[PDB]
From Swiss-Prot:
General function of this protein: Cytoplasmic uridylyltransferase that mediates the terminal uridylation of mRNAs with short poly(A) tails such as such as act1, hcn1 and urg1 mRNAs, hence facilitating global mRNA decay. Uridylates the 3' ends of actin mRNAs upon S-phase arrest. Also has a weak poly(A) polymerase (PAP) activity. Residue His-278 is responsible for the specificity for UTP. Involved in cell cycle arrest where in association with crb2/rhp9 and chk1 it inhibits unscheduled mitosis.
Family to which this protein belongs: Belongs to the DNA polymerase type-B-like family.
A GO-annotated cellular component: cytosol
Designated name of the protein: Terminal uridylyltransferase cid1
Range of residues in the leader sequence: none
Record's catalysed reaction(s): RNA(n) + UTP = RNA(n)-3'-uridine ribonucleotide + diphosphate; RNA(n) + ATP = RNA(n)-3'-adenine ribonucleotide + diphosphate
Main location, first listed in the record: cytoplasm
Gene Ontology biological process: negative regulation of nuclear-transcribed mRNA poly(A) tail shortening; polyuridylation-dependent decapping of nuclear-transcribed mRNA; RNA 3'-end processing
Record: residues binding ATP: 282
Effect of residue 278 to A/N: Abolishes the UTP specificity and converts Cid1 from a TUTase into a poly(A) polymerase (PAP)
Effect of residue 100 to A: Reduces association with a 15-mer A stretch but does not affect association with a 15-mer U stretch
Consequence of substituting residue 64 to A: Abolishes catalytic activity but does not affect RNA binding
Amino acid sequence: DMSHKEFTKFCYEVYNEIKISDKEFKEKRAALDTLRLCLKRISPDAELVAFGSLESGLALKNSDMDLCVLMTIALQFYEELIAEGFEGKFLQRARIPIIKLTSDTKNGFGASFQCDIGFNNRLAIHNTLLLSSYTKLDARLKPMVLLVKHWAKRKQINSPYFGTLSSYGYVLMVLYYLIHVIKPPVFPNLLLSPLKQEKIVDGFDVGFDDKLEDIPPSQNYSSLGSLLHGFFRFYAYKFEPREKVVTFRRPDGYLTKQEKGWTSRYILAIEDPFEISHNVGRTVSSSGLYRIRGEFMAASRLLNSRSYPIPYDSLFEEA
Ligand SMILES: O=c1ccn([C@@H]2O[C@H](COP(=O)(O)OP(=O)(O)OP(=O)(O)O)[C@@H](O)[C@H]2O)c(=O)[nH]1
Ligand SMILES: [Mg+2]
Ligand SMILES: [Mg+2]
Ligand SMILES: [Mg+2]
Ligand SMILES: [Mg+2]
C-alpha cells in the first residue's frame, strides 16, 4: 500500500510532535505514586487507579491524568491533599464526587499540574482495559488516535461542555471504524468474540476476549495515511448520525436509533461498549454535530485533492 505515502510520512511527523514524551509520562507516574501514598495515609482499604489516555497509551503531550479511588473518604482525601501542598477543588455531597487538582506547590509536579480524581468509577477502568488491549493489538491505532484527537482540538470540536464531543467519543468512532467499517477489518470485535466470557461489574457486562497473544495479526495492511483518510471519509459521507448508532454490540455494526430507543440527548449516538445505556455523544448538540460533520467533510476533501503537493498542514490548523 503506497496509496498514501506522503500523507503517511507527514502523519508520523506530526505524531512524533504531539505524543506524550517519556519524561512527561515518567513525571505523571511519579505523581500517581505520590498520590497513592497520600491515599494510603487515610485508609489501607482504598486504592488509587489510573485510567484514561495515560493508562492506555493514547495520551497527547501536556495532558491531564484521570485517577480513580476504589473501595465518605473523598472529603478526608481532599483535605490531606491540600495539607500536602496540592491545590484543587471539590464539592462534598455531589452526585458524582470529584477532586480536581489544579496545581502543586510542594511536590514537584508544577503549577500547571492537573488531574481529576473520581470515586469507584470501575466502568471507566474497564473500558480503559479494552482500549489498552486494542493499542496492544495493532501499532497503527495509537498514532491514528493521537492524530484524530489533535485534529478535533484544533478544529474546536473537542468540547463536550460546549456542544461537541469528548476525546473518548473520538476514540470510540475510531475503533468502530477499524472494527466494523474498513474491509478487511484491522481489528476483531473483542466483545463479540466466541471466546469472550461474561463479567459483570456495577450491572454491566465488561467481559471481552483479552487473550491478546492468541489474536492473529491484522489482515489489513493499509498505511496509517490510508486508515485516516478512510476514517474521515466514513464520517463525512457514509455514516448517518440521524438514524444510526455507533455500537460495539452488533456483529455487523448495524444499529438503529429506534431499536436502541435513543430517539429523544441523542443527536450523535455512540453506545459505550460496556455502559450500554450511556450515550458517549450525549453532549453533542444540533449545531455541534453540524460543525463536526463540516470538519469531517473538509478533511475528506483535503485528502481527496487532485493537485500536488497537498497542504496537509491545514488539517491541524486552527478553526
Ligand atoms: O463518556 C465517557 C467519557 C470518559 N470516560 C472515561 O474517561 C476517560 C477519559 O476521557 P477523555 O475524553 O478525557 O479521554 P482522553 O484521556 O483520551 O482525552 P484527553 O485527555 O487526551 O483529551 C476515558 O478514557 C474513559 O475511561 C468514560 O468512561 N465515559
Ligand atoms: Mg482526559
Ligand atoms: Mg467517566
Ligand atoms: Mg464513502
Ligand atoms: Mg481540514
